[PDB]
Structure formats: C-alpha cells, structure tokens
Ligand binder design. Sequence first.
Ligand SMILES: NCCc1ccc(O)cc1
Length: 174
Amino acid sequence: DTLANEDCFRHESLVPNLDYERFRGSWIIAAGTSEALTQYKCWIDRFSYDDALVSKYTDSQGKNRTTIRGRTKFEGNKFTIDYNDKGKAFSAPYSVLATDYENYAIVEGCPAAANGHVIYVQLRMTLRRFHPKLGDKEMLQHYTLDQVNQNKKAIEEDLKHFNLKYEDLHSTCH
Ligand SMILES: NCCc1ccc(O)cc1
C-alpha cells in the first residue's frame, strides 16, 4: 500500500531518478486524457520546499477560482499528494513519466476526479516567461499555448513513447 508497490500506474517512467529539487516550482496543466478534468481550467500546481503543494484552478468562464493545498511525498519519479479534505478527489499516487525540468513534464496518476486515470502535460509557469500583458483577458491561455508550441517537438516525442499524441488530449487551458 506504499508508492513502492502502487499498482494503478500503466507506464514506465523515463525519469526514475527524478531530481525533486529541480522538478519543484510552478506548472500549468495544458492537456490530458481525462474528460472529467476539463472542468478545472488552467490548473497551476506549485510544489515548494520539502513537501508543500498549492493547486489553483477556475471554472470554464474563469469564475470560482479555487485553491487546494496538500502535502507530497516523492520516491524517484513517484509522488503521492495528500490534499486537505477539500481536494480529496485529487489525492492520489502520481508518476512523472518524462520531463526536461526546465520546460515541460508528462505525468500519470490515479485520482477519483479523473475517473481513476489520467496522463497530462504540464508546462513550467515562471515570471521569467510570463508577462501579464495588462489588457489580456486570456493571460493564462496564451501563455500555455505558446509554451506548448515552443516545446512541441520534445513533448510530442515523449508522448509517442507512451503511445499518445498531443492532438489526442483534451485541452484543459483553453
Ligand atoms: N496535482 C494535479 C491534479 C490534476 C491533474 C490533472 C488535471 O487536469 C487537474 C488536476
């Protein structure tokens, strides 16, 4: 019942010795294989310090901004998130399947909110690349698409490895 013998993962990671300190920071979830997760728009995960997680998302009109907080535990590529009672539908085991640390990562996991399985693509969110161009209604959405496009070859190559294509994912940030 630990991460060591978690059975819901379907794929072998390309990053079994994931460097958690390098993985840490803010990530925006661009797309994934779960229809249910399309209801949580422009989700940003913020992994910080030893084991902290702050997750923030909206509905599809950008209304009802929601924040859930939790604790993580990493063993190589595997990680659990235990959310505060609030986001318990998202508490699950997860696995980083691929990342270049600096730009993108592809993650699998088994939350109830995803009908027990999802693979998703996330791009790094940093003020070094994100200049809220004051006047933009679609701040997040434009950032995400540009970051996707900029890293598209690498993302597509890794997805191919897990028998997926970007175009087959549901977009989860416009
Ligand atoms: N810690 C992220 C949990 C999650 C994964 C994928 C997604 O589209 C929304 C939430």
